[PDB]
Design an enzyme around this catalytic site. Structure first.
Site, short mmCIF file in Angstrom:
data_model
loop_
_atom_site.label_atom_id
_atom_site.label_comp_id
_atom_site.label_asym_id
_atom_site.label_seq_id
_atom_site.Cartn_x
_atom_site.Cartn_y
_atom_site.Cartn_z
NE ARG A 20 -2.07 -1.70 3.36
CZ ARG A 20 -2.52 -1.90 4.59
NH1 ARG A 20 -3.78 -1.58 4.90
NH2 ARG A 20 -1.73 -2.41 5.54
CG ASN A 38 -3.88 -4.66 2.75
OD1 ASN A 38 -3.42 -4.38 1.62
ND2 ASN A 38 -3.13 -4.97 3.77
#
Length: 91
Positions: A20, A38
């Protein structure tokens, strides 16, 4: 049209590897807004808006991931820009 909205999702070794943060760094370098998130199945999704060429560059990075990732499969789509986002976030 020079702008688009991109959705992308990647599968494989893509969580717990700094994915990320990697997508965010690249998105900010590219002037892209949106987010990386996620998902509970172990995959990662990205929703992003900005110049279509920049989004394509970001997708190339998404397909690779940071060095600890291994992206096994992806899907993605480009659709009309909505002007929804103000920065690039992670979830």
């Amino acid at each position: 049209e020079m702008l688009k909205r991109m959705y992308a999702r990647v599968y494989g070794l893509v969580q717990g590897v700094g994915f990320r943060k990697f997508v965010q760094i690249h998105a900010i370098r590219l002037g892209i807004k949106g987010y990386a998130k996620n998902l509970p199945d172990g995959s990662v999704e990205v929703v992003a808006e900005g110049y279509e060429e920049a989004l394509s560059k970001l997708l190339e990075r998404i397909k690779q991931g940071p060095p600890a990732a291994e992206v096994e499969k992806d899907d993605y789509s480009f659709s009309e820009y909505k002007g929804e986002f103000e920065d690039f976030e992670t979830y």
